[PDB]
């Protein structure tokens, strides 16, 4: 009968120097860490997209409750929580009429259907910032509904609506992934919302019922949107509360290019996080990383140095010195030829360790009494380099679970290096709280690998880009 260890739920700090456990609760009590004071809203959409944006931005001053407030606390109001004021009449509008939609969207082929609509926003967004001197904190995009259904792969346009044929057959494509790519050489922050989200009351089915049932969850939506919006304007709402300073977390990303003849070409990415999670992302160059025989991705000793240094030296500028500890998170185990590329560039002082976080199917843990599963924080330590961690399960403050069944832990193996495992766990847990795009109690996967695939889908959508080190708020 082996026993597990409790990794105490680590805390995050807020304004006025006091820390709490839930990022939603403390925000109304204290507010964001560093506070900007003005957010001019830049709108890009139809006329209907305006009032839908106008009415909702008019409504987040008003509180909206959830169905079960005990499980997702209330929203007081923007001016009440964050201190910054967000006004409806403060709107900079660049219109893209529905008349431009039907011309550029009615194409037989999906790639030219997507690309031409992406073409329409890039000129109207870039030129709206160029000409007008108006400092727009974030530019908001109100994509109409009839585009989301029609601008992905595996969703062909009907044989009816077309108004321009494709000129050759088919012998990436997602919109918010593609639009985000051509705005990387222009460090301009964007947030994409559909009309289906803000105004779900209008768009119904045949039965007179809303297409997306938000009636129970209308309050929590004010948490997700109005938190992620404040960040891209330039203010980080919360650091992590307690940390040994001078520590680095690097998140590895590959992505196989399906369009290439070689089954090894992939666009690599390396995302670094520190205490704040604003972070920085350093793009790695393209090369053969997919080993189709063994199946796992691996790097070549050339790109690992050009990536760690281009990453680590930016830390020598972020803080005045070199890092003391660096932990490298990734999906696959590390072989030997790759690690000597890292150890060679790493300072002799700095200890370096690589960690394998896999969402595998190894164990469920059925609590022996009662209908509620085990509480988040239990962790089986099998050996001194491998351990099980329950990121999901029950949460005591919330009185509800995060997984709708018996939870599944994630498997953490220290493949390379040597380190006190219980210190990784107490740190990996703290990397769950940090997620700005949604204010939740915790994530299931640490934030270093959260947007692995969404970052990968940005780089491969445009190959000619030379993407420098950029903050994360330009990538989300």
């Amino acid at each position: 009968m082996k026993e597990l260890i409790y990794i105490e739920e680590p805390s995050i700090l807020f304004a006025h120097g006091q820390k709490c456990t839930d990022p939603r609760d403390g925000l109304a009590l204290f507010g964001p860490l560093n506070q900007i004071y003005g957010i001019k809203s830049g709108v890009v959409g139809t006329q209907k997209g305006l009032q839908i944006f106008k009415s909702y931005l008019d409504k987040i001053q008003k509180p909206i409750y959830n169905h079960n407030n005990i499980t997702r606390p209330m929203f007081p109001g923007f001016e009440a929580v964050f201190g910054c004021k967000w006004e409806s009449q403060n709107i900079v509008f660049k219109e893209i009429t529905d008349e431009e939609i039907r011309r550029y969207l009615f194409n037989a082929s999906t790639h030219k259907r997507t690309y031409d609509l992406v073409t329409l926003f890039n000129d109207k967004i870039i030129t709206a910032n160029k000409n007008d001197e108006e400092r727009v904190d974030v530019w908001f995009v109100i994509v109409p509904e009839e585009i989301y259904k029609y601008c992905r792969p595996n969703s062909v346009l009907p044989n009816e609506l077309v108004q321009t044929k494709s000129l050759i057959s088919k012998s990436d494509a997602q919109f918010h992934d593609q639009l985000k790519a051509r705005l990387l050489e222009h460090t301009i922050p964007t947030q994409i919302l559909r009309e289906s989200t803000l105004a779900w009351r209008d768009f119904k089915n045949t039965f007179g019922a809303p297409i997306r049932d938000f009636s129970k969850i209308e309050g929590h939506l004010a948490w997700t949107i109005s938190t992620a919006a404040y960040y891209k304007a330039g203010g980080k709402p919360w650091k992590l509360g307690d940390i040994r300073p001078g520590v680095c977390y690097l998140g590895l990303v590959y992505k196989k290019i399906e369009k290439s003849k070689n089954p090894q070409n992939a666009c690599c990415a390396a995302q670094m996080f520190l205490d704040n999670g604003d972070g920085t992302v350093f793009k790695g160059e393209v090369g053969p990383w997919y080993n189709p025989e063994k199946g796992e991705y691996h790097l070549k000793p050339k790109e690992a140095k050009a990536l760690l240094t281009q990453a680590l030296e930016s830390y020598k500028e972020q803080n005045k010195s070199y890092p003391k500890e660096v932990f490298i998170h990734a999906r696959t185990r590390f072989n030997d030829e790759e690690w000597n590329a890292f150890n060679e560039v790493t300072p002799k002082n700095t200890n370096l360790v690589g960690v394998t976080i896999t969402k595998s199917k190894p164990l469920k843990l059925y609590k022996t009494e009662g209908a509620f599963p085990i509480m988040r924080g239990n962790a089986y330590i099998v050996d001194e380099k491998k351990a099980f961690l329950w990121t999901l399960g029950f949460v005591p403050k919330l009185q509800s679970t995060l997984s709708m069944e018996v939870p599944n832990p994630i498997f953490i193996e220290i493949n390379k290096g040597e380190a006190e495992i219980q210190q990784v766990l107490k740190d990996i847990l703290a990397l769950t709280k940090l997620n700005y795009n949604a204010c939740i109690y915790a994530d299931g996967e640490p934030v270093t690998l959260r947007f692995a695939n969404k970052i990968g889908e940005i780089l491969t959508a445009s190959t000619e880009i030379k993407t420098p080190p950029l903050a994360f708020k330009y990538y989300i």
Partner: protein
């Protein structure tokens, strides 16, 4: 002196707001008092308010909401407030907080209708800013702002009941330990005896083709009828390896490394499972990565096993409980049993559309919780067991793999408090 500020609130419709303001205010330098902060067992509940409103209370706050007017206690708490308002003779002693939009001018109580109100409907802050300017326009004794005192109640008032207790408890797992393996794993130099065209799943016993050999727990004399010309084989040509040397890491050679052996043993356990399964009274369900095994309707009494249901209906559809096995060798030689839900239209005939199988599994599966998953999983392996606790997996005519249905438990401390 009189400094404590009371807040009279409508319970329980508008208790949410008081929780937002009192914590906001105590940190802003105020010594506040409200009946949300103290848990009272004392027989005298009013004796606290009637006292604390009269001598030390500096201002009275009342929530002008829908249920603010109607609640009995709220208008009766206000009685002493308008009684003391005559004592200090201040016109703005009583200040309301208007939070409801639907209330017209008519429905508001006449004691407060004409009183200088505060609009909270547009923005909760934009009223709060308009309120504490009056706190500065009249000299209210208040200490400088310190939010260190703010959440110390929050951890004591709300978060105290819902936190990590120290209760120790045990959890059951889905890892099922292996009782005992066969002694040794033997390899056979069959060369021409096994045809290049023969697939090893037909063998009726677990066999994996190796580079030159065919690995098996069964002895070389086990399958001759399925594959003839084995009778010529001699036992000394086989290279034998003890089982307990493999998982103990002791063995490693130039022609096979232990981490390669460890991959072979997993596949033999699974093929061993599938074979013994067709002896064990279950229909199979063809999934992507494995076969699922489920119980037909009525194959047990009242579709219950050990008072535990294993087969039920959803709407018209009939749902069964199923499992799918797998092997793993670290840390312990174990057998991993995953749970699945299969759907049938009449009790026997599967629903061919995969779309229904998944979309209707979560319609049911979301409804279950910790009790029903363990109850139906731990009951199903007891059904597949051969005696009491054990399972006999045939990997030879005389060499078998034995598996215990009782999964290894996990001890722990600091359990949550169950609701």
């Amino acid at each position: 002196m009189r400094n404590k500020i009371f807040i009279s609130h409508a319970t329980p419709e508008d208790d949410d707001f008081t929780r937002w303001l009192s914590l906001k205010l105590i940190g802003l330098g105020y010594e506040v008092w409200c009946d949300i902060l103290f848990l009272d067992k004392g027989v005298d509940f009013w004796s606290t308010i009637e006292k604390e409103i009269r001598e030390n209370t500096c201002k009275f706050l009342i929530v002008s909401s829908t249920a603010g007017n109607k609640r009995e206690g709220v208008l009766k708490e206000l009685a002493v407030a308008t009684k003391v308002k005559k004592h200090l003779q201040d016109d703005m002693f009583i200040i309301p907080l208007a939070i409801d939009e639907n209330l017209s001018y008519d429905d508001i109580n006449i004691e407060i209708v004409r009183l200088n109100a505060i609009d909270f409907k547009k923005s909760w802050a934009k009223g709060l800013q308009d309120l504490l300017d009056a706190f500065e326009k009249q000299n209210v004794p208040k200490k400088p702002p310190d939010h260190s005192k703010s959440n110390l109640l929050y951890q004591q008032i709300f978060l105290h009941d819902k936190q990590a207790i120290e209760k120790e408890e045990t959890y059951d797992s889905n890892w099922f330990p292996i009782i005992s393996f066969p002694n040794e794993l033997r390899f056979h130099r069959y060369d021409w005896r096994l045809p290049k065209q023969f697939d090893v799943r037909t063998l009726a016993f677990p066999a994996i083709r190796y580079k030159e050999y065919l690995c098996t727990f069964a002895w070389e004399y086990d399958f001759i009828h399925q594959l003839p010309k084995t009778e010529t084989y001699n036992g000394q040509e086989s290279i034998r390896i003890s089982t307990s040397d493999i998982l103990s890491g002791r063995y490693d050679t130039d022609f096979i490394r232990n981490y390669e052996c460890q991959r072979l043993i997993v596949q033999l356990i699974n093929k061993a499972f599938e074979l013994r399964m067709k002896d064990k009274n279950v229909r199979e369900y063809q999934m992507s990565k494995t076969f699922a095994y489920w119980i037909e309707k009525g194959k047990l009494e009242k579709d219950k096993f050990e008072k535990i249901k294993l087969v039920g209906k959803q709407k018209n559809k009939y749902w069964h409980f199923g499992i799918s096995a797998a092997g793993k060798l670290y840390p312990s030689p174990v057998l991993m049993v995953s749970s699945h839900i299969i759907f049938t239209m009449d009790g026997i005939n599967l629903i061919k559309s995969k779309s229904i199988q998944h979309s209707s599994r979560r319609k049911q599966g979301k409804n279950w919780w910790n009790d029903k998953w363990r109850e139906k999983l731990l009951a199903f392996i007891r059904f597949l067991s051969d005696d009491q606790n054990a399972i006999y997996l045939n990997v030879g005519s005389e060499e078998k793999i034995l598996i215990s249905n009782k999964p290894l438990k996990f001890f722990g401390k600091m359990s949550y408090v169950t609701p």
